[PDB]
Each structure stands twice: as C-alpha cells, then as structure tokens.
Design a protein around this ligand. Structure first.
Ligand code: GTG
Ligand code: SAH
Ligand code: SAH
Lengths: 293, 285
RNA sequence: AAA
C-alpha cells in the first residue's frame, strides 16, 4: 500500500477530487476482507447518521422505521448504544426475511415480517402519527442472475420515494448506488441529501448512503452515472489502498482512518482521557460484538 | 365562441374532415376529467360486448389515479366484477386505499416484469390500460410506444387502451409500429394537444402492427390543429343542453353509452345526472 | 447481507 499524509478523509461523495476509468478485473479481488464486514459497514453509517440526529436534538422521542432490516445483526448494537445513553427510541424493523434472533426479547424493538408496499406504508403512518418518524431504508430486490438489474434498482428507488412521501419522516438514510452507465435505461429521480461515503464497504462497491433532514426531487442522468463510476473507482482503487502515515492509531489503513472520523461524532457515557482512547474503545466494542478480531 | 350546427361530434380521428397548418400557442382537474371520460367510454364499450365482467384491469402508469376511484365504484355498484391492478413508480391518491379489489404496485415495468405478472394473473382475462410517460422528446415517446407494444404481446389482453400522440414531424426520428385500433378523440384534452387514445379489441390472438411514417406525423399535426383551433372552439346551437360548448357536446355523446341502474325521463336527464356526478366527484364547480 |  502507498503512504500518504492526510488531515481528513473524504466524508461525502462530492469531496472525491479525482476519477479513474473502471477496470472490470476489479470484480476478482476479495470483496470483503473482514468477517461480517457488511454488518460493520451498516453499523458505522447508521451510528453516524443517528448521532448527527442526536446532535440536532431530533432523535430523542422518535421512532426509527427500518425497512429492509433483515438479518440486522448490527441493529442490536445500535439499539443498545442509544438505550445505554438514555435516549428514548422505539424501533420498528420490517423485512420479508427473518431477523437475526439476537434481536429477540427487546420491548422497544418491534419485528415485522412483511415486504412493504404503498398500502402497508399508509397503515403504519396512520398508526405512528403524529410521532416523529426516522426512516432507514436498506431494501434491495433481485430477480435471478447474481446481481440486481437496473429495473430492480429503479423499482427499489421508486419505492424509497414512496416511503418518503407517505411516512413523511423528519430524517432519512437511503441506500444509494447509481445504475452503471453500461446498463442505463431511463433517467429517474431521488431526494436531495448528503451522500455519505461508507468505510468497509465492499472493495469496489459504488454504494453510498443518502442522508436527508426535511424542513423536492433531483434528476439522475446517464452522465451522472458515468461520473459515479469513475469517482468511486478512483476512491476504491487508489484512495482506500493508502496507509495514512501521520495517523496516530494502531491501524493506519485508510478505512480505519475514515472510520475514526465517523466515530468521533458518537456520544458516550464513559469518559476517556483522550479522544483516541474513546475511539479505540468504541472500535473494539463494535468489533467484539460483530466477532471481528 | 363561434356558432355551429352539428348532428354528431367527431368521435374518432378518421372523422376529422379538414386540416390546418400549425402555429404557436381550463376547468379544474381537467386531466382527471379527460382520463375518466375516455376510460368510462372504453370500459362501457367492453361491457356491451360482454368481456368486462370477471376481468382484471392492468393499468400501467396509473398514479395518482384519482379518477380510478370513480370508475371502480361505477362498475362495482352495477354488479360488474372487476379486479384492478395499478402499477406505477410513484404513489397513488389515498382515495384508492382501503379497497380490497384494488392492488397498488410500485414498480418500474420492463419485459421481465410483464412476464411474471402474466403468470400470476392466469387464468384471469386481462384488460390493459396504459398511460405511461416520463417527465417530451421523440425518443422518450418511441421508448414508451415500444413498451406498450410488448405489454400487449406479453399480457395477451382481450382489449387495450393506449396513450397515443404522434411525434411532430419537426422532431421526427424514424418510422415505428403501433397496434391496430380505433383512435378515440378525447374531450377536455388540453387546448392544443394532439394526444388521442388507441382502443383495440382482440380475438383469436390477432394483433396487427401498423407503420407510422413522417407523412402520417404531418397529417396528424394538421388534422389535430384543425380540431383544436376550429372544431372545439365552436358552439353547437342545435344541442339541447345547459352547456353547448363543443367539449360538452363531445362528452354528452360519450356519456350516452354509459350504463346506469337509475331510470330517467329523458336521455338528456340521464347525461345531466352523470355529468353532475362526475364533476361533483372531481370537485369541479 | 451472509456465506
Ligand atoms: C401540438 N404541439 C405542441 N407543441 C409544442 O411542443 C411541446 C409538446 O407539448 P404537448 O403538450 O403537445 O405534448 P404532450 O406529450 O401531448 O403533453 P405533455 O404536457 O408534454 O405531457 C402530458 C402528460 O405527461 C404525463 N405526466 C404528467 N405529470 C407527470 C409527472 O409528474 N411524471 C411523469 N413521468 N409523467 C407525467 C401525463 O401522461 C400527462 O398526460 C410543447 O412545447 C408544445 O407547445 C408542438 N410543437 C410542434 N412542432 N408541433 C406541434 O404540433 C406541437
Ligand atoms: N419491499 C420490501 N420491503 C421490505 N424489505 C425488503 C423489500 N424488498 C427487499 N427487502 C429486503 O431488503 C434486504 C436487502 S439486504 C439488508 C440487510 C440489512 N440491512 C442488515 O442489516 O442485515 C433483504 O433482506 C430483503 O428481504
Ligand atoms: N416504466 C414505467 N413503469 C411504471 N410506471 C411508469 C413507467 N413509465 C412511466 N410511468 C408512469 O407513467 C405515469 C404518467 S402520468 C399517469 C397519470 C395516471 N393515468 C392518472 O390517472 O393520474 C407517471 O406516473 C409515471 O410514473
């Protein structure tokens, strides 16, 4: 790995300052180096999103509606974290697949086995209104093959718009991965929001998280798709294979450097002599729960 | 506006008997009124031919679909059994919620999705209604007309109603094929819209494609401009009705083909109740 | 996402 000095990592997509032509050979590298790296990827991004809402004082008293939550192993850590902080949250996890049994026996966590559609979204809105809803969507459908088709993505993203216009959440975190330019079909629309980059995403994933706080929609064109492809490939090929030699941490690889800056936003009841001691404690706690050495 | 004197309105595109060269260029909820009338006319025709009862209406491009609630109630109250499948990429009007015979689907439709819903709707007879459109470039239209064609060839419906608006010749690209059918003109369409509804009834799996040429695009633009500038701005004075503007005269003759359980003294009385009913549902004072 |  190449060495580099950095004052900060790229937190949002628009900070990526270079592009590189996608090489299809990338699909052969190991996608997830760490065990349960997907749960880790989700835990860090959702801890980041929710801690920002806690910062703005809108998290306390809210109901987090998480659609596409199964198996959701990491959600148990997320829930325990805010419960131990004394934040009053109710959890509603909805997925057609069964959830991880580690989520059982929690009074503030309602498990629902169902694929959501427009009719069902209206019923849970009427049930939860007038309480604050925070939406987390990680839905993904697939029709055969080995990867989702562009039609599957367009249907998923249309559904995520339906979630927003019906649930009317105070804030939302949406799965966002643009269709690749060679599989384009039609322009489509997604909400406004910040495009949070994900440490410990798959090695060459172009997925990010669309974070919005609500106080319209934007068109996505094929030229945007080309831009996403080249920017994320530079990020995955070059940036995430750097060692940050000025970074004071046991692991200096970029993804740990990136994770570090996200964990700095997290609240904690325990006091620490240094910020590093806090982050190191949080990281080992996350890794231990997820069975990562 | 201008005073007129007619015996019947222009019901289909072929009846337009004059052209006119183009030039650059509205009730509340007129778009829902336009769709309601055209679909009530199409489905009533199917009721007369006895192929409506027991069918599934596959409506692609249905949102928001406010007027569909009126159609569903109209035929339901008559004892006609219709199942409704409304498929779109955005959500529908809440007035469609809570109806067990109406299924709301959020999906971007492609060929493979059509095949799967064909399998799951079997053995029901299918009635297709398509109003798909993207937020128009000629290429967008050709894309939608290509999709509407595979809707028919895959779903094998007993009848279909297709959105049909020819690309303008100053935006022509290449010839394309559309199904054979009757080109129904729509009252209360936009003042200078060239859009009509293509209505087809199939038997023996006889589907026939017809070429659309650049010369056709000119003949559409000319005939529709004569209809939009001349025919529709007239006032049929020999028409016994509270409103004699040509659109209501057009609508009057469409609503006359609509069944109703209530008896009436005059046929005028029946159409006046239907129009008042349709306006009162759509909140059109 | 997990394997
Ligand atoms: C008649 N004419 C107009 N222009 C000019 O060219 C353009 C065509 O507009 P137009 O209104 O004629 O287009 P349409 O597709 O019919 O309607 P349109 O309003 O485009 O589409 C309406 C439909 O869109 C759909 N729709 C409505 N809202 C939405 C939405 O939010 N999303 C999506 N996806 N579809 C929507 C729905 O199906 C609705 O009925 C305009 O600039 C005209 O002035 C002409 N130009 C030339 N050279 N020659 C002509 O003869 C001519
Ligand atoms: N319409 C729908 N409603 C709810 N969940 C859906 C859905 N379509 C797809 N999904 C779910 O989307 C998920 C994508 S993977 C989600 C992983 C999950 N966030 C975790 O923490 O492990 C799948 O579990 C799938 O069942
Ligand atoms: N491939 C596709 N799959 C599903 N819906 C589509 C589509 N392409 C376009 N549409 C839908 O086509 C619609 C055109 S407007 C339709 C209005 C509707 N007939 C009503 O009664 O209100 C849009 O809502 C759009 O989302």
């Amino acid at each position: 790995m190449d060495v580099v000095s950095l004052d900060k990592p790229f937190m949002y997509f628009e900070e990526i300052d270079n592009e590189l032509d996608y090489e299809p050979e990338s699909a052969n590298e190991v996608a997830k180096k760490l065990p349960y790296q997907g749960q880790l990827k989700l835990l860090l991004g959702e801890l980041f999103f929710l801690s920002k809402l806690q910062r703005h004082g809108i998290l306390d008293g809210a109901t987090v509606v998480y659609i596409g939550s199964a198996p959701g192993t990491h959600i148990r850590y997320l829930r325990d974290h805010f419960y131990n902080l004394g934040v009053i949250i109710k959890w509603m996890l909805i997925d057609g697949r069964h959830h991880d049994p580690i989520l059982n026996g929690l009074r503030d966590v309602t498990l629902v086995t169902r694929f959501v559609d427009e009719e069902y979204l209206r019923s849970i809105k009427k049930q939860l209104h007038p309480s604050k809803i925070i939406l987390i969507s990680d839905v993904r459908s697939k029709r055969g093959g080995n990867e989702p088709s562009t039609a599957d993505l367009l249907s998923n993203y249309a559904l995520q718009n339906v979630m927003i216009s019906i649930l009317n959440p105070v804030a939302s975190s949406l799965k966002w991965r643009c269709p690749f330019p060679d599989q384009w079909i039609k322009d489509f629309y997604i909400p406004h929001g910040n495009k949070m980059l994900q440490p410990f995403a798959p090695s060459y994933s172009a997925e990010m998280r669309l974070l919005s706080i609500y106080t319209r929609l934007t068109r996505v064109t094929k030229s945007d798709a080309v831009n996403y492809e080249k920017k994320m490939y530079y990020l995955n090929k070059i940036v995430r294979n750097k060692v940050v030699i000025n970074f004071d941490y046991p692991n200096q690889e970029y993804d740990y450097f990136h994770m570090y800056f996200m964990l700095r936003t997290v609240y904690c009841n325990k006091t620490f002599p240094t910020t590093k001691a806090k982050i190191l404690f949080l990281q080992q706690s996350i890794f231990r729960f997820l069975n990562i050495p």
